[PDB]
Amino acid sequence: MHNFTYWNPTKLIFGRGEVERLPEELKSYGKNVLLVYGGGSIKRSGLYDQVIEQLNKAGVTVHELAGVEPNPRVSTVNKGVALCKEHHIDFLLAVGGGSVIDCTKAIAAGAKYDGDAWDIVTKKHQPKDALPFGTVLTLAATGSEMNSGSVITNWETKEKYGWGSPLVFPKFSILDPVNTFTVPKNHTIYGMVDMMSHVFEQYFHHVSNTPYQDRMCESLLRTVIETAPKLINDLENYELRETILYTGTIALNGMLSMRGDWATHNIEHAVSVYDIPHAGGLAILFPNWMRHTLSENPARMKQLAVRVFGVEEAGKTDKEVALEGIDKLSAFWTSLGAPNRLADYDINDEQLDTIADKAMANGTFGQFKSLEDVLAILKAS
Amino acid sequence: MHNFTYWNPTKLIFGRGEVERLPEELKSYGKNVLLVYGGGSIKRSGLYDQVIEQLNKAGVTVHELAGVEPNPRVSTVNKGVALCKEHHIDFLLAVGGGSVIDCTKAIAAGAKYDGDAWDIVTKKHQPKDALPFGTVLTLAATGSEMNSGSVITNWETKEKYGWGSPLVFPKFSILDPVNTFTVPKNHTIYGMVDMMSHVFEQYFHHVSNTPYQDRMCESLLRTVIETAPKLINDLENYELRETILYTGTIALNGMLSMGARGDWATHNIEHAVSAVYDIPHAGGLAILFPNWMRHTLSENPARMKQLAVRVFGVEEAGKTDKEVALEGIDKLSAFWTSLGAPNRLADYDINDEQLDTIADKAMANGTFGQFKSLNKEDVLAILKASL
Ligand code: NI
Ligand code: NI
């Protein structure tokens, strides 16, 4: 039983060398641009110089906000909002991954808000305006290049919250598979785990009559599973990078959600306190959430076990088939190098209660199961 | 993989009773609305009264353009543009199927053009502005609820031209499966045959490395194959209508073709046939598509083979790629015939008398098609094989 509204105004520009589309795409906007990026990777790869060149071709007056953290922080958002006020910025260009875009979304909203951007992240102020912005993507993961959501951390309060607004869809996102070539193996693996985890979140629901969405989810998982072993030992293969970029962006922010569970993400956000790799936390927690919630409807995980993970049902219960499917998932991720226990990041049980309390700060959560549940899943991990 | 730009700003509102979303969606537009619809169907079903009621809740001043033709005429577009200037229209609401939406798109562009809308249809004048419009869809799988295209007929010249513009995407389209309950058995079958055909058109290409698009196409075909036999014997089942309405939007909005150009040769040939004989579009496609598939098989048999194996359940053990594919084409043709679709030109009482004239119409713009570039001899062979 579900009604839905779909709306995605982001322009998607896909293909080799399409960073050259920046001047044509920037003509309709002002000439004061704030360039936002993360660590040294864009300068190390040469994408920085590529972009600065195109921003020069567009007669744009460029300011920079470098150093966005892998788990982006409000202090950095506030610094960028300040730069927009100081230099009368008209437009923002995020060059990097999901963290850079999530941060750019908050600066875009924060540049038309009189106060502090943490108000927006916490949903105290619903944005009424935003600067326009665009992206040049360097790794697919969560679909941020083509959705309106953003996850920001407050290092002081040790909180990490997801917010969104219809006003902070990217105007355009330039997706060049070549721009993902320098992503190293570990982050390449993290991106694929995150992509698969997002599909899982959209699959575990109780809405009857989603036959095509189910096949789209299963199709996406199969494609990533086929691609990942070939990609990780051949990181500069255009075709394999193209497939993961396509399935991480347009495929995942398609009609796959056209209601997800998202409990595993909420628990990971709470554990992340530790400032750990997001998708690393997901690889540890997701199989145990699947085990914890299997009974709510074993048919969902059973269908993944049979249609995605090649589990043979002969002489097994529906529960058995599903649990086998979870084991193959975890083994698949572990075979890529992904972690599978909290000890892999040197995390013990000391702060589990504090972590669970943060996860429950906004009440019970989850759709496949409304989640003490949090603590049990943490302990199993 | 082909470079591509994807942009589709249409808001899709989907679900039971969602026509009640109209007033909330209209708050952002002016209050002079031209309500555009076709024949008597929406009044007979009660949808017309539902819409008028909602338009009353939105404090809107309603003018109407009723009687849009199944092949909408530029004359009717011009009538709508005249109404827009006269009553100072701000917004258009299309209630109906692809014909009603296509006509509304041409009125929307024509309402900002000083001259004759036929200039827009023929691409003599490229639109620079348009009135906004929204839709309430009454037919699945026409593609117009979520794209920027429109097909308009000049009754005088007997020409039918496809045009489009980034300015005439619908602002929103309200998709309620209940609003397709009165679509009769034959047209329900036609919509599903056309939807499968459009997937085929987007699947038959020589672009390497489209594994996910391939699976999206295969997945869509499998869902329709599972749904269609049940729907035609249960025409008011919400779930079956819902699945067809949902998949029919995806099949036709471009979310399948991104990164690969479709073939569209079978559509072009059916369009040539229909310019001569007054047959249903999907009927022509059911006849022609299996024979197009046989004619072009040698271009790359692995392509139809993959459909045969992944969609049509053909076992490949001890068979050549061509045999596997041909068995798949056979199973496709049998599936369509099992729904009631025709499979030979003779089913519509069409012989070989006009095949040459039809082939010439198909070739009016030179060679066509991407999986195989067809010339006149190709068209004649496909046509004759279809008798
Ligand atoms: Ni994620
Ligand atoms: Ni068609």
Numbering used by the authors:
A (entry chain B): 1 to 258, 261 to 274, 276 to 374, 377 to 386
B (entry chain A): 1 to 387
Quote the paper.
Based on structural and biochemical studies, we report here that YugJ from B. subtilis is an atypical NADPH-dependent group III AAOR that reduces furan aldehyde in the presence of a Ni2+ cofactor. YugJ folds into a two-domain structure consisting of a Rossmann-like domain and an α-helical domain. YugJ interacts with NADP and Ni2+ using the interdomain cleft of YugJ. YugJ was highly active as an HMF reductase when supplemented with NADPH, but it was inactive with NADH, indicating that YugJ is an NADPH-dependent aldehyde reductase.
To obtain structural insights into YugJ-mediated aldehyde reduction, we determined the crystal structure of YugJ in complex with Ni2+ ions (YugJNi) at a 2.15 Å resolution in space group P212121 by molecular replacement. The asymmetric unit of the YugJ crystal contains two YugJ polypeptide chains (chains A and B), which are arranged into a homodimer. In the YugJNi structure, a strong electron density peak that belongs to a metal ion was found in each YugJ monomer, although a metal ion was not used for crystallization. In the spectrum, a prominent peak was observed at 7.46 keV, which corresponds to the X-ray emission energy of the Ni2+ ion, indicating that the metal ion observed in the YugJ structure is a Ni2+ ion. The Ni2+ ion is located between the two α-helix bundles of the CTD in the interdomain cleft and coordinated by conserved aspartate (Asp194) and histidine (His198, His267, and His281) residues. Given that YugJ exhibited high aldehyde reductase activity in the presence of Ni2+ ions and was observed with Ni2+ ions in the crystal structure of YugJNi, we conclude that YugJ is an atypical group III AAOR that favors a Ni2+ ion as a metallic cofactor. YugJ exhibits interdomain flexibility in the absence of NADP, given that YugJ chains A and B in the YugJNi structure adopt open and closed conformations, respectively, which differ in interdomain angle by ~10°. In contrast, the α9–α10 loop of the YugJNi and YugJNADP-Ni structures adopts an open conformation that increases the accessibly of the active site. Accordingly, an additional three-pointed density was not observed in the YugJNi or YugJNADP-Ni structure obtained in the absence of nitrate.
